Amino acid sequence: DHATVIHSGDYFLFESDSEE
Amino acid sequence: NHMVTASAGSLVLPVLVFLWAMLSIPRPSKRFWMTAIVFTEIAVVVKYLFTDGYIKYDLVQLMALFFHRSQLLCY
Amino acid sequence: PLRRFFHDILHTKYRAATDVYALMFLADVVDFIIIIFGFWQVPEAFLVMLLIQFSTMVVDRALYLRKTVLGKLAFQVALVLAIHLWMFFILPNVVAQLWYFVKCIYFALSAYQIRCGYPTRILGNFLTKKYNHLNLFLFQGFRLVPFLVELRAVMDWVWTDTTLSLSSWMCVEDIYANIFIIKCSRETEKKYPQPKGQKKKKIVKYGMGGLIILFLIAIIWFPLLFMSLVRSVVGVVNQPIDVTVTLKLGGYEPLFTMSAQQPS
Amino acid sequence: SWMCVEDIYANIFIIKCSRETEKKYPQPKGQKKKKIVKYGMGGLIILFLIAIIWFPLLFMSLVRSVVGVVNQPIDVTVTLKLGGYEPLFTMSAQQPSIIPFTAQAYEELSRQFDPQPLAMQFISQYSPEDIVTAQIEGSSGALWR
Amino acid sequence: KVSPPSLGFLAGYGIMGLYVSIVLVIGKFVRGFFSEISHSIMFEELPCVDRILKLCQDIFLVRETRELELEEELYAKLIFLYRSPETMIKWTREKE
Amino acid sequence: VDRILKLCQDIFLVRETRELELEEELYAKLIFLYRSPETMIKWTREKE
Amino acid sequence: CCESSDCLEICMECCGICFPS
Amino acid sequence: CCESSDCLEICMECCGICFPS
Amino acid sequence: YLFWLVLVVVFVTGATRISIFGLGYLLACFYLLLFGTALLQRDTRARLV
Ligand SMILES: CCCCCCCC/C=C/CCCCCCCC(=O)O[C@@H](COC(=O)CCCCCCCCCCCCCCCCC)COP(=O)(O)OCCN
Ligand SMILES: CCCCCCCCCCCC
Ligand SMILES: CCCCCCCCCCCC
Ligand SMILES: CCCCCCCCCCCC
Ligand SMILES: CCCCCCCCCCCC
Ligand SMILES: CCCCCCCCCCCC
Ligand SMILES: CCCCCCCCCCCC
Ligand SMILES: CCCCCCCCCCCC
Ligand SMILES: CCCCCCCCCCCC
Ligand SMILES: CCCCCCCCCCCC
């Protein structure tokens, strides 16, 4: 659902995994 | 010409410039330029047959439209 | 038949792709400006022309964001005819001649959009393309225009296909705006670095500070000055034109009206 | 601090209500935003903005434009003050003699002075039943003193 | 004819200047929403606010029973939740 | 702020290609960056 | 053709424009 | 003696007083 | 380009003197402006009738 998917952000997304 | 004269004078060719010439396959056509020359000539003739004290900005119009014709004839 | 062929070749065709919306909108902004300036039945006419410029700009944004060549064709046709018919409703002029001229430029750039096509990448603010100083100043100026920023946001939201609501659309717009302004400043500091520990340049300080002080002076003192100046002007000679002495004597019939006028 | 806990609670409630309604009526993942919803809210906002700038101007102009109430001289008091010592010649008239010029009468005056542009302009610009006729009385009887 | 002044101040500039001023101030009023909406996404985009309303309602319950010592203690929790944004993230997690 | 403008521009790119599922997902990143100040510090580090 | 579902949506989302969510 | 370098500095810094940086 | 400055004069002689001869001058211009580039290179010596 839109609600749950826009409120799913966590710290793992911002880990520096080869962000080019 | 539509900024110096109004009504039936102009308001036919400016409309056609915006709706036919500039809205066309690449170069306008041949019929556009022909109708432009024709309308300008007709306008000159009927303004000469009297609107009174007619102005001739259609001189510079006709002559520019015949200059372009020469440029496109040479291609 | 021929008309159908013209329209087919204006829609299907095989042409390129350009984005001249920026310039079309700029033409319409100039038009708005000169109509606003041209307030000089006339107020009513200028007010209708205001509503018009506005409505047409909104419709243009719609067709641009929805990438409609057919819609732009229709709009162009209608607008050309209508603006040319408004030349007949002159009854409420250099201002109008200029308005016609700049609208002609809009019609020329609009015609170009239709005969070229709409490019795939249409999103992206014009003044956020480069990260210089001019872009910075222009963007900030756009943000200073009373309602342009908010209108742009709401309008774009309504046309652009989004999953987010207005609240969230406005969030991403705010974030982007702020981020751009920061980026421009960061870029300019990399371009022109300032030595470590180099005062702040006496002149720069004097300028900004001075302006602020003068602005504050004009908040308190200047109004007082203006007020006093206008109000002080008082005193227009008033002299009795005539000396009407009616020596009403008789209680029953008051008379003795021998009196004089300006010559005496 | 009391106001702090009230603000927190208020905001928290509003969020909770929204969360609850999203659980009650979930919105599919990636489902546009419904053209109509957009058109409605957006439209209202635009109209509100229109009414910030244009509507006041409209109202203002509408009220101010209404101007023009016929004012005709009720009487034609021609006092031909002659004698320097005793000004007299006060033979004059009033409304009965004064004739509010009709539409036809106005046309006559305008045409009389049509050659002169500004002369005709004056008459024509003044509304019909505006130009009044100064039929000043000339008869005396009033001897002088 | 006579001309009745239906302006009040001055149609030419008095009312005009006032109109401009109003527009500008309404401008700022409307900006007041779409300018700093991003400075609150930390107090307004909380996934599950159930644990915070429990805290808030416990403060209310503890004021009705007049055990005001615990009011001070539960207020301390509220202010620390709102003093550290990272703990808000932890406490407002959707599931746990 | 380079990493944040990339995020913002990716939302824009994903709306032009009409893959709106990823719009929701990239919006989630934006809001978490702005929900935790410490992650903003990490993401906005000068070099890395 | 504003449906009742759309009508509540509209209202709630304008409320979200002002108030939170 | 306002130089052009100073002039841009002034302008940009007043912009920073209002807008960010 | 003299062939053409004459065409200009032909037009303006008609314009100035409002008459029937003037309409004829106007027509003579219109024509030799259209059918003119042809006889600018074909009437050079080949029958300038
Ligand atoms: C290109 C030409 C630019 C000028 C266009 C026409 C000028 C119209 C008025 C421009 C005046 C410029 C002054 C800007 C002052 C900065 C404040 C601001 O919010 O400026 C805002 C834009 O708001 C506006 O609409 C500008 C007008 C503000 C009103 C100030 C004018 C003073 C006259 C009224 C006096 C009363 C003041 C208000 C009373 C109470 C209001 C609640 C820009 O930040 P921002 O958040 O988007 O930043 C993003 C990240 N911080
Ligand atoms: C001040 C923000 C940069 C915008 C540049 C022009 C804005 C108006 C300032 C001077 C106008 C006379
Ligand atoms: C921030 C202060 C700088 C000087 C004022 C800028 C122009 C605003 C118009 C007010 C009149 C001084
Ligand atoms: C937020 C804009 C929605 C429409 C305005 C709501 C009603 C407020 C009264 C203002 C007159 C339009
Ligand atoms: C559901 C009501 C329409 C959206 C709200 C707009 C403000 C009221 C205008 C019409 C009231 C029924
Ligand atoms: C009649 C036009 C608006 C007048 C007041 C209505 C308020 C609008 C509410 C917006 C959502 C409830
Ligand atoms: C006079 C009653 C109308 C209500 C005033 C405005 C309410 C809606 C405006 C903004 C919505 C929060
Ligand atoms: C570079 C312009 C001087 C600083 C800005 C002050 C506002 C304008 C006053 C003089 C305009 C040239
Ligand atoms: C003429 C005095 C100020 C009038 C408006 C100028 C605005 C000042 C801009 C400050 C930095 C661009
Ligand atoms: C009327 C045009 C002058 C611009 C209004 C003020 C612009 C500068 C004031 C504050 C700088 C952001």
Author numbering:
A (entry chain A): 1408 to 1427
B (entry chain A): 1698 to 1747, 1779 to 1803
C (entry chain A): 1941 to 1980, 1999 to 2050, 2060 to 2231
D (entry chain B): 2135 to 2279
E (entry chain B): 2426 to 2521
F (entry chain A): 2474 to 2521
G (entry chain F), H (entry chain E): 227 to 247
I (entry chain A): 1165 to 1213
Paper text:
PIEZO channels transmit mechanical force signals to cells, allowing them to make critical decisions during development and in pathophysiological conditions. Here, we report several near-atomic resolution cryo-EM structures of fast-inactivating wild-type human PIEZO1 (hPIEZO1) and its slow-inactivating channelopathy mutants with or without its auxiliary subunit MDFIC. MDFIC, a MyoD family inhibitor protein, has recently been identified as an auxiliary subunit of piezo channels capable of decelerating channel inactivation and attenuating channel mechanosensitivity.
The multi-lipidated MDFIC subunits insert laterally into the hPIEZO1 pore module like mPIEZO1, resulting in a more curved and extended state. We obtained a 3.0 Å resolution cryo-EM density map of the hPIEZO1-MDFIC complex. The overall cryo-EM density map is similar to hPIEZO1 alone with a disk of about 30 nm, but allowed us to validate the MDFIC density with multi-lipidated cysteines on the C-terminal amphipathic helix. This C-terminal helix inserted laterally into the pore module where the exact position of mPIEZO1 is found. Interestingly, while MDFIC does not significantly alter the curvature of mPIEZO1, it induces a more curved and contracted architecture in hPIEZO1 from the side and top views, respectively. In addition, another fatty acid chain of the pore lipid interacts with the acyl chains of the covalently linked MDFIC lipids, forming a stable hPIEZO1-multi-lipidated MDFIC-pore lipid complex. Therefore, we deduce that the hPIEZO1-MDFIC/hPIEZO1-A1988V-MDFIC/hPIEZO1-E756del-MDFIC reshape the pore module and fall into a deep resting state, in which it becomes rather tricky to remove the pore lipid from the hydrophobic pore by mild mechanical force.
